[PDB]
Every structure is written in C-alpha cells, then in structure tokens.
Amino acid sequence: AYNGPAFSHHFTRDEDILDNLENGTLRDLLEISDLRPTVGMIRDLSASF
Amino acid sequence: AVTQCLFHAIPFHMFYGDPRVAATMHQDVATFVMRNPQQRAVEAFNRPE
Amino acid sequence: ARRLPKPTLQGRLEADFPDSPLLPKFQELNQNNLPNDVFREAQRSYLVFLTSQFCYEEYVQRTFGVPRRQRAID
Amino acid sequence: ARRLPKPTLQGRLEADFPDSPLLPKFQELNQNNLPNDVFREAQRSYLVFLTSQFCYEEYVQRTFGVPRRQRAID
Amino acid sequence: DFRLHLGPYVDEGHADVLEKIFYYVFLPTCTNAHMCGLGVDFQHVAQTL
Numbered sequence: 001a002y003n004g005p006a007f008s009h010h011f012t013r014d015e016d017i018l019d020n021l022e023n024g025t026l027r028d029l030l031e032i033s034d035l036r037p038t039v040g041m042i043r044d045l046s047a048s049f
Numbered sequence: 050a051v052t053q054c055l056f057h058a059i060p061f062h063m064f065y066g067d068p069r070v071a072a073t074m075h076q077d078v079a080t081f082v083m084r085n086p087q088q089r090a091v092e093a094f095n096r097p098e
Numbered sequence: 099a100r101r102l103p104k105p106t107l108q109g110r111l112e113a114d115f116p117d118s119p120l121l122p123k124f125q126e127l128n129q130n131n132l133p134n135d136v137f138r139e140a141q142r143s144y145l146v147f148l149t150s151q152f153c154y155e156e157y158v159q160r161t162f163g164v165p166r167r168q169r170a171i172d
Numbered sequence: 173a174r175r176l177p178k179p180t181l182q183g184r185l186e187a188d189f190p191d192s193p194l195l196p197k198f199q200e201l202n203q204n205n206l207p208n209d210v211f212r213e214a215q216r217s218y219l220v221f222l223t224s225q226f227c228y229e230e231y232v233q234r235t236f237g238v239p240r241r242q243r244a245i246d
Numbered sequence: 247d248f249r250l251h252l253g254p255y256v257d258e259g260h261a262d263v264l265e266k267i268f269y270y271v272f273l274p275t276c277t278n279a280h281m282c283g284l285g286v287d288f289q290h291v292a293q294t295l
Contacts, residue, residue, distance in 0.1 A: 001145075004111075004241075047153035057102060
C-alpha cells in the first residue's frame, strides 16, 4: 500500500503496475517473479490487511 | 535478499524442518550447516527443542 | 524481543499525491511524543491502514450491487 | 616476461566522431618520457578507461532509483 | 606482481562443494574432459569492447 498507483486512486485500474510503481521492494518483488498484476487487484490485496 | 524483511523460516516439523530449504531463507543456519555439513540431512538436522 | 528488518519504501507518498481523499484523515497524530524516525514509520503504518480502508470501502459497495436494473433500463 | 598479442581495432575514432564528451579529459598525458609507438598503447588503455567510467556512471545514474516519484504528477 | 586481484569471499550453505562437484564430476563425464583452461588479457578485451 505504500506504492504509487494503489494509493492515489486516480491511477486507473486496468493499467500495468510495473511501469509506474516506484523503486520500492514491491518492484524487486515483482521483477524477479515477472507477473503483471494490474492495479486494483493489488488494491483489495492490500485491503485484506 | 529482497525478502529477508518479509519472511523468517521456522524449522518446526520432521517433514517441514529441512536444512536445505532453511539455509536458503535464513542466513543463520546458512552458517550452521556451513560449519556442520553433516546436519544438511533432514533426519539429523538440529531444531529448537 | 525484536521484529524483522524494515522494507525499502523509498520516497514519500504524501510529498507526491496531494489529491488523495485520505489525506484529511491522516493528520490526527503527534510528533512530540517520540523521535522523528519512529513517528515516520508510524505515519507509514497509518497511511497504509487508511489506504486499505479506502480500497476496502471502494470494494464493498462495488461487489455488492454493480448489476443494476436502473443503468440497464436507460 | 612478455604478454598476449594485440587486437586489431582498425579505424580511428578521434578523426571521425568529433562531438563526443570527455574531450578536455585527454590532454593530460605525458609524451616526452616514452615514444609514440608505446604512447599509442598508453592512450588505448586510457580512453577505454574513461569511457568505462562514463558508461559506469551513466549506469549508476539510470539504475539508482529507476523510476521517479515526481513523474507521477504528469 | 605477486598480488592476487581477487574478489571478496562470499558465503553459502555449501562451503565450495557445488563448485568442485561440478568441476570434478559433471564436466569430465559430459565433455569427456575435452576442455583446456585458458587465460585472458583484460586490457585487450576491454579495448575491443
């Protein structure tokens, strides 16, 4: 939830998250795995907390 | 290296305490089986009592 | 007796997105009871709590009743 | 006592491509203590070190923080 | 020269055993020991590059 697009809520849903997420630990988490979860499915993922 | 701040390994069971996998995600047993390589077997692996 | 090391979390979001609706619900905290870095990480925890709040509230009214007749009537 | 043979590298770069950076970073070499045939190797070892420094610094410039937080505005 | 331009020692859970088990089992069987070690001149390959 301390990433770019899932916090702003004016970043739209169906865009790739890997090209606008900052250089956080989620970036190197998603880089070594190489999947493309578009933001919004990461939103409720964070909202499970 | 990117998930040492996310996960910590617990060798708790006879099937689920294994030092080949624990030495990967824990850099304490990675020294312990470096000094005691005979502990790398799953049957003779030391676990907290 | 201790917890894990902290993640990276580079930069600040509050210094990047002033258009966030959870920003008025952010400043109910207090610096002067603790040092700067522990208050900073408490701000991180409160911000991710309110971010999860905003995603959950936009979830709960979404999956409840998005198939509507009134949008399909017109 | 000796070394390994010399690669070819045909063609000159300084008399072909004149709008390259680090051009005042080349006049600070000594010429009187060694002849031209070994100063050739002494500058072949040095300009590759300069462009190695330049590509390494541009690499650590790119791969420092790879996105930008302030690009989220536009 | 009599100095070793050497990289720093890193640790693993194996204590050099995978390196030597590769270089003394897997290559001499699979390649039938059809290899020879070589040396490089690093300034020459950098001047090519």
